[PDB]
Amino acid sequence: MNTISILSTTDLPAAWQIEQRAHAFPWSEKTFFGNQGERYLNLKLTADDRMAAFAITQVVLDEATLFNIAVDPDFQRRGLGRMLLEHLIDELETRGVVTLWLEVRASNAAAIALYESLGFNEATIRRNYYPTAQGHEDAIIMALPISMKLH
Ligand X SMILES: CC(=O)SCCNC(=O)CCNC(=O)[C@H](O)C(C)(C)COP(=O)(O)OP(=O)(O)OC[C@H]1O[C@@H](n2cnc3c(N)ncnc32)[C@H](O)[C@@H]1OP(=O)(O)O
Please, are residues 83 and 43 in contact by the beta-carbon 8 Å criterion? no
Q: Is 70 annotated as a binding residue?
A: yes
Residue closer to ligand X (CB basis): 110 or 151: 110
Report d(CA 2, CA 138) in Å as an integer: 34
Q: Please name which of 129, 22, 127 lies closest in space to residue 73, comparing C-alpha atoms.
A: 22
Whichever of 79 and 145 has its CB closer to ligand X, that residue is: 79
Does residue 50 have a known ligand-binding role?
no
44 — phi, psi (to 5°)?
-120, 160
Q: Is 95 annotated as a binding residue?
A: no
Rounded to the nearest 10 degrees, the angle between the axes of helix 80-94 and helix 109-118 is: 40
Select 130 or 150, whichever has its Cβ closest to ligand X.
Answer: 130
C-alpha to C-alpha distance for 51 and 53, rounded to whole angstroms:
6
Which residues would be at the binding site for ligand X (CB under 6 A)? 22-23, 66, 68-71, 76-82, 102, 104, 108-111, 113-114, 117
**Residue 37 in marked binding region:** no
Among all residues, whose Cβ is closest to ligand X? Answer: 81
Q: What is the DSSP string of 62-74?
A: TEEEEEEEEE-GG
Active site residue 103: yes
Residue placing its CB nearer to ligand X in the complex, 41 or 150 = 41
Asked about 116 being catalytic, the answer comes back as: no
DSSP annotation of 9 reads: G
The nearest distance, CB 85 to ligand X, in angstroms, is: 8
Closest separation in Å from C-beta 37 to ligand X: 19
List binding-site positions for acetyl-CoA.
69-71, 77-82, 108
Binding-site residue ranges: 69-71, 77-82, 108
Q: Which are the catalytic amino acids?
A: 103, 115
